[PDB]
Amino acid sequence: GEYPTVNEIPVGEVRLYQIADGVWSHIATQSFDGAVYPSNGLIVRDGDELLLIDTAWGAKNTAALLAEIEKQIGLPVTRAVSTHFHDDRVGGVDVLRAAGVATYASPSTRRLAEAEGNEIPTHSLEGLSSSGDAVRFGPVELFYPGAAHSTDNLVVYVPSANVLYGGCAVHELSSTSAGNVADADLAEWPTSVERIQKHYPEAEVVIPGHGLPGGLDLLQHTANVVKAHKN
């Protein structure tokens, strides 16, 4: 009931929301094709450091995110992972890299970001090119579920907290439309959701790329949203 909504966050401000011990989401807003949308990422405590998942969608938002983390948490962000190549995930990577954060993404995401003219994470994450692949990265597991919202989309699990961050492959419960599907695989998306459901059956919190966290029901809801879009 306290998660911040789009009309509560002016463009350029970032909120943090405590999900579990050592796990936060970050929430920002951005204008795109003349409409404002909220967007989520993740922060995970990594001893006396933090791991960031996704930018706050833009250079100014990402600078505000680092300032909010400094104020609220006070531990340095040392690494960041972007979960796909679009601007709500990589826009702000240059700000992170100037702030000394080591930025990472799969080779699939890096090639697509490059081709798109988007910012490119520095380092390549091998071991994620096949659907069902999983790799450990600090306090999280990165999982490639297969093509869904994009061909390169990753999801992130925090085993200590049973938190699943789905990024843009997972929609919030109130969603009635599939968002930007220009780079999506609408036929594979339900199968990729099924793989996530099978691999993370103990997830307690599921965080979508945009909107409110909930439970495991966000996964089936997302498959349903995608099916309604398809027909």
Instruction: Give me the residues that bind ligand OK0 (CB under 6 A), please.
Output: 32, 37, 86-88, 149, 168, 171, 175, 177, 179-180, 209-210
Tell me, yes or no, if 152 is annotated catalytic: no
For residues 51 and 24, the answer to whether their CB atoms sit within 8 Å is no
Smaller CB separation from ligand OK0, 168 or 205: 168
Of 46, 54, 87, 88, catalytic: 88
Please state whether 207 falls in left (phi above 0), alpha (psi between -120 and 50) or beta.
Answer: beta
Cβ neighbours of 155 (radius 10 Å): 29
Q: Which of 27, 31, 25 is nearest to 11 (CA)?
A: 31
Quote the Cα angle for 175-211-223, to 5°. 40
Of 149, 153, 171, 221, catalytic: 149
Smaller CB separation from ligand OK0, 46 or 152: 152
* 32 interacts with, out of ligand OK0, Zn ion, none, CB within 5 to 8 A per kind: ligand OK0
Tell me, yes or no, if 149 is annotated catalytic: yes
Please state whether 133 falls in left (phi above 0), alpha (psi between -120 and 50) or beta.
Answer: beta
Give the range of 20-28, 44-52, 70-78, 87-95 binding Zn ion by CB under 5 A.
Answer: 87-95
Instruction: Give 3-state DSSP helix, strand, coil % of the chain, rounded to 5.
Output: 25, 30, 45
Tokens representing residue 156 in the block? 């992130």
Which ranges of 22-152 would DSSP assign to H, the alpha helix?
59-72, 87-90, 93-98, 107-116
3-state secondary structure of 95: helix
Tell me, yes or no, if 46 is annotated catalytic: no
* Positions at the binding site: 84, 86, 88, 124, 126, 149, 168, 210
**86 is a contact residue toward Zn ion (CB under 5 A):** yes
Tell me, yes or no, if 88 is annotated catalytic: yes
**110 is a contact residue toward Zn ion (CB under 5 A):** no
* Positions at the binding site for Zn(2+): 84, 86, 88, 124, 126, 149, 168, 210
Site string for Zn ion, 125-164 (x = CB under 5 A): ----------------------------------------
Residue of 88, 119, 152, 172 interacting with Zn ion (CB under 5 A): 88
Smaller CB separation from ligand OK0, 39 or 68: 39
Smaller CB separation from ligand OK0, 46 or 119: 119
For residues 156 and 203, the answer to whether their CB atoms sit within 8 Å is no
Of 180, 185, 224, 229, catalytic: 180
Alpha-carbon distances, residue 216 vs 53, 151, 158, 180 (angstroms): 20, 22, 14, 23
Tell me, yes or no, if 221 is annotated catalytic: no
Active site residues: 84, 86, 88, 149, 180
